[PDB]
From a paper:
EhpR behaved as a homodimer during size exclusion chromatography and crystallized in space group P212121 with two and one dimers per asymmetric unit in the apo and GA-cocrystallized form, respectively. The structure was solved from single-wavelength anomalous diffraction data collected at the K-edge of seleno-L-methionine labeled protein crystallized in the apo form. These crystals diffracted to 2.15 Å and the structure was refined to a crystallographic R-factor of 20.5% with Rfree = 25.9%. Also noteworthy in the EhpR dimer are the extended N-termini, which give rise to an "arm exchange" between the two monomers. While these arms are too flexible to be traced beyond G6 in the apo structure, all residues including those remaining from the N-terminal His6-tag after thrombin cleavage could be traced in the atomic resolution data set. While the apo and complex structure are otherwise highly similar (average rmsd < 0.6 Å over the complete monomer), F109* undergoes a significant conformational and positional change on ligand binding. It adopts a different rotamer and moves together with the loop from E103 to G110, which leads to the formation of an open conformation of the ligand binding site with respect to the apo structure. This movement is required to unblock the binding site and suggests that ligand binding follows a multi-step mechanism. In addition, the finding that the binding site is blocked by F109 in the apo structure indicates that the ligand needs to induce structural rearrangements.
Residue numbers in the entry:
A (entry chain B): 8 to 129
B (entry chain A): 7 to 128
Amino acid sequence: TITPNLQLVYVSNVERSTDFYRFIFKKEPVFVTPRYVAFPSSGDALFAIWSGGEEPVAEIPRFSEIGIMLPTGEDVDKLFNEWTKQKSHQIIVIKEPYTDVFGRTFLISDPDGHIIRVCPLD
Amino acid sequence: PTITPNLQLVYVSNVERSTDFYRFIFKKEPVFVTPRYVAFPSSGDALFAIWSGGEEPVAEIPRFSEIGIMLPTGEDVDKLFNEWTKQKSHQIIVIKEPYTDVFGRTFLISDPDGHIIRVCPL
């Protein structure tokens, strides 16, 4: 068949990133080992964090995004409100909610500088 | 609303060449095409998108993520490699030839903007 069913990101601290994605996704990982953790994605697809590649560098620009498509533009803002209201987890804002071609969007950075974009279903 | 990472977005320099590249790699037409934004189906309702409106990628800047393709067995992985390097129409930049890593039988290639693509087995 041939599908991109594994989105894989390099992380420096597997514990801290596991805990961050657990909070972002509101889901447990389906696979945990000390250096490699996978969270469910859509269908038989996985989103994986791994310390076995190279350690991300904050000052190095990134050329991709972890996109999170929710049903509506309303789900996006009340997901930004809920994320930035809570104190317990560091949510670094890159762009507060605005309107792109697909609609209501925002951008946060994960602990290792991976860009996460939240947006409505295109 | 469930929060899934269902949009793997990559920045490309040339949407045309990238669309032709991904079309060949996936064996699949894209489902959404504009001049600056192209999406291919991934698993479930997830998408793999290429976008020229981001920061333009640079070949020699290191990358901290990978586009993973999980096939059923190690013997598909070796299979997929022979084909890709064998054919002449589409230039395929090998980063690592087939070897054993933590995923099993894997290999790595680069897309035309230096995005890293890994093929491995479920």
